[PDB]
Write a protein that binds this ligand. Sequence first.
Ligand SMILES: Nc1ncnc2c1ncn2[C@@H]1O[C@H](COP(=O)(O)OP(=O)(O)OP(=O)(O)O)[C@@H](O)[C@H]1O
Ligand SMILES: Nc1ncnc2c1ncn2[C@@H]1O[C@H](COP(=O)(O)OP(=O)(O)OP(=O)(O)O)[C@@H](O)[C@H]1O
Ligand SMILES: [Mg+2]
Ligand SMILES: [Mg+2]
Lengths: 334, 326
Amino acid sequence: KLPTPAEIVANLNDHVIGQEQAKKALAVSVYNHYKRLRHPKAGANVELSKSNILLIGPTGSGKTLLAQSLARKLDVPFVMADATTLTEAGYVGEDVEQIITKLLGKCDFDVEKAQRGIVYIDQIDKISRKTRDVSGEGVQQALLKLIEGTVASVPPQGGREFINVDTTNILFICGGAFAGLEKVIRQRTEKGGIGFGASVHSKITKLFGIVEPEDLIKFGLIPELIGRLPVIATLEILDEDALINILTEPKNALVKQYQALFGMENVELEFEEGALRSIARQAMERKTGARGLRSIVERCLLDTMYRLPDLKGLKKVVVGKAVIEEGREPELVF
Amino acid sequence: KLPTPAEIVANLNDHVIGQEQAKKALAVSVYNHYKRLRHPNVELSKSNILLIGPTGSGKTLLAQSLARKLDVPFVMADATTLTEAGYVGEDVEQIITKLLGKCDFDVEKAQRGIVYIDQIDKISRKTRDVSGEGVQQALLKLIEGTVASVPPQFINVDTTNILFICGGAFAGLEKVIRQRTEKGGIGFGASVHSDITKLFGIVEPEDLIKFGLIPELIGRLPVIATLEILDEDALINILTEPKNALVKQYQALFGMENVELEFEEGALRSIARQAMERKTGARGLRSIVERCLLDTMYRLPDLKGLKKVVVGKAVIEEGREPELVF
Ligand SMILES: Nc1ncnc2c1ncn2[C@@H]1O[C@H](COP(=O)(O)OP(=O)(O)OP(=O)(O)O)[C@@H](O)[C@H]1O
Ligand SMILES: Nc1ncnc2c1ncn2[C@@H]1O[C@H](COP(=O)(O)OP(=O)(O)OP(=O)(O)O)[C@@H](O)[C@H]1O
Ligand SMILES: [Mg+2]
Ligand SMILES: [Mg+2]
């Protein structure tokens, strides 16, 4: 049978912390994706179209991790695409049908399976409008007919007879960090006016949560592509508390990754709660999202990691709060 | 015998709401197409069709719906994949290869087919414009009769009798038309004065030339049919009347469970209004319904005993839960 959307989110929960709405949007679409694919395809039965998703969120919020985490249990062909390598048909670069070639390769060129797969297109915000915009609007236009059902003509599994792939039922998840999108939403929601007769109006998570096509059009996406991404799911910006859970709760938590490296030696690595909050706070100030957690941990551990493989008798190393706030050595337990 | 244009529209009516002028233009052209193919005497030339309309107006659906009852080979081409003959990309003769493939490479049948070229507006003029004007130029001798040479199942295909339906959302065209018909000048003696349906309905070759199509291609598309921007009422029928209406699609998805989905009349009108504000045409209807039903669809497979879901007007305007009836 099919897993319920709650089971999909439960699996996503082992990897992504926060973004409850983005996890919900992905889980429901994938569940509906499954249902559509087992729906009768002939007779008096209504034809079912698909709802594609656009993921809008800040750097290091978990967009790509959601897609990668989702992929672990999809049971349909899944591919990670990259919009920065796409160009118009007549130019250097990859054409939009290259995506289908990659999805098709993932299932050993079994087309019937490729047509049931799910495509994640990363960096969708990088092909916005803001001559011939070969790598920008030209790609958005080329994708219009790939996202909506067409028949892609892609090379065979050998060297360059081409394969006809019906993309009608391929689910597309697009996303990116629309960095300039908050200013547009603020301009629309806080217009106001200047001068007497006119009235003057009051002045990331909140703004993205209210995004509308008008903003994406002014940002630089074309209306024809926006309407083909009917579901807009947003990711918030991680705060100090979310960044603490990301250090220890996930299946591949940052702390767990270092404990494993120290575990290839015979030394146990422990962080104090004061350190975890200090790390999360410092990382938050770097404005790189969760990624900033790695810089802090690499920083505080650099000198103990240098010595560790040469030290003999060490059993446990403790990273206290002081080791994050001040240039202190971690306590070494022999 | 042949279906009358009224029968062609009657079949289009089960898929496309409104757009009466576009349906009339297609029905008459297809009927004339059938008549040409039966005429052995004056030599007859074909009238090709250009479909101009906004996003979500139903152009491609008309072509898809039309294709269900054509009795001749039919394909949809994609102008965004076409390039000049000497460059990477698909040469315009691939259109014939696809039309020819649909009939298992029976050339006599392929030569009698109908081709819809989507995204025709994407090969406008605005060096060597390999993916733009170069394609328009390449198509001139494909749309007007030539002898194509295409790979085996080379095969010679006479395109004289192939009907071409081209279309696209000439997004910048409404600005061009306003510049022509609304002078918008400054001064005491100036005519000064600041609606997609009204504008497109008066489109002239002059506007398409200024937009970016070449006069040689415009003259080969003698029939310009225009689609209206969907209004509030059209967008309500699009939710429930078509064979593949949006609401019916969700009722079917809910029907993959044992739960019945019901919309109130007030909800349908509210959805249509919100869809218009998104400026995506009918496609905006899907965004609104997805928004309103996201939480219900998430929980519905886990809920036990649920038998009916009611989406009222208050569930479109306010962030409320659809009434769950157990
Ligand atoms: N919500 C989250 N929960 C758990 N880990 C997260 C979260 N957000 C980011 N991370 C961590 O950040 C790292 C990279 O995240 P990710 O690849 O999702 O960023 P991204 O979406 O690619 O950002 P960008 O859009 O700038 O490319 C991973 O190690 C991941 O564990
Ligand atoms: N007049 C209409 N009647 C019924 N459904 C419509 C109508 N117009 C649009 N739609 C709906 O809009 C969705 C997409 O329609 P369609 O593919 O015709 O748009 P489009 O022609 O691709 O727009 P564009 O050419 O700008 O991409 C479908 O769900 C279709 O049912
Ligand atoms: Mg990424
Ligand atoms: Mg279309």
